[PDB]
Ligand binder design. Sequence first.
Ligand SMILES: O=C(O)CNC(=O)C(=O)O
Ligand SMILES: [Mg+2]
Ligand code: NI
Ligand SMILES: [Zn+2]
Length: 331
Amino acid sequence: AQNPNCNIMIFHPTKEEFNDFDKYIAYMESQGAHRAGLAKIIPPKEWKARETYDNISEILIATPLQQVASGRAGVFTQYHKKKKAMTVGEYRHLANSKKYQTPPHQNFEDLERKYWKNRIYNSPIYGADISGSLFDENTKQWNLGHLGTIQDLLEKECGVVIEGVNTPYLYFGMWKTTFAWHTEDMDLYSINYLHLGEPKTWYVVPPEHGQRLERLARELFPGSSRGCGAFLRHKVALISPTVLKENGIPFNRITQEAGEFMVTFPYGYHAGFNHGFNCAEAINFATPRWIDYGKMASQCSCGEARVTFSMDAFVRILQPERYDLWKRGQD
Ligand SMILES: O=C(O)CNC(=O)C(=O)O
Ligand SMILES: [Mg+2]
Ligand code: NI
Ligand SMILES: [Zn+2]
């Protein structure tokens, strides 16, 4: 069995190996990358996403979200408070202000200590889930706006044509902006490209151990757990590496820098934070190996998780027994 300790693998494809996306994901899996739940892909030196980032300041962040925490330093939830619209240029200035800027630090490890110690006492502002792309239309390799769609993958594997579309999302982050413990909708893959700015630290639980994380989460968030049998779908719970180690949950950590891709694998629980002002782009995708994970994915039916139009057909076709109850939660 390849990668039996489920370590995060890092790949350095040549320009020739960067041509065929599907083939390269399948190569990574042949080496055991999926066992970690997360992999890093460093693009060939010849490659670029676009010529410059000099003209992005007029992008609108229509609903910036202030991430307010409750709980204790290592075990907390966050809720998103909606703020007034601002441009990327306005947001970058805010990120760099004395109230919100990255503190002085020695190295990534010192910054990670400061995050875990102090996150709860601040409420950073995140520009999340903004439909759009920063890839140049002429970038032919690993362009997240030109991937094969999940609807076409289900059609190719299963023979059923379905409605729905699949487009990327932009994330503008600042110091301490946080992504809570989750897997993707329908336990899909994701791919994330860090276009510019400061790093993003990730934590991940191997897919084979995901239920261990879920059991801990039910213990640590006992009211949430009673309200919904899949409450990590709400994307609001944080658990620190210290707490995970104290409870024996297997995980790994890695920092992504500007110009690097990360791939999350089906049922790979992940969480993390941004080091300072940055812009990432991400999208879900599928392969043939995903289908069995989609069929088994948990669902939130309490009404909190509320998701895209395109998840309907996935539930309808892969999980027909669940469909009725899940749609009640959507309406
Ligand atoms: O970058 C973020 O805030 C969160 N991204 C992801 O969870 C992802 O790409 O799967
Ligand atoms: Mg602009
Ligand atoms: Ni994710
Ligand atoms: Zn729920």
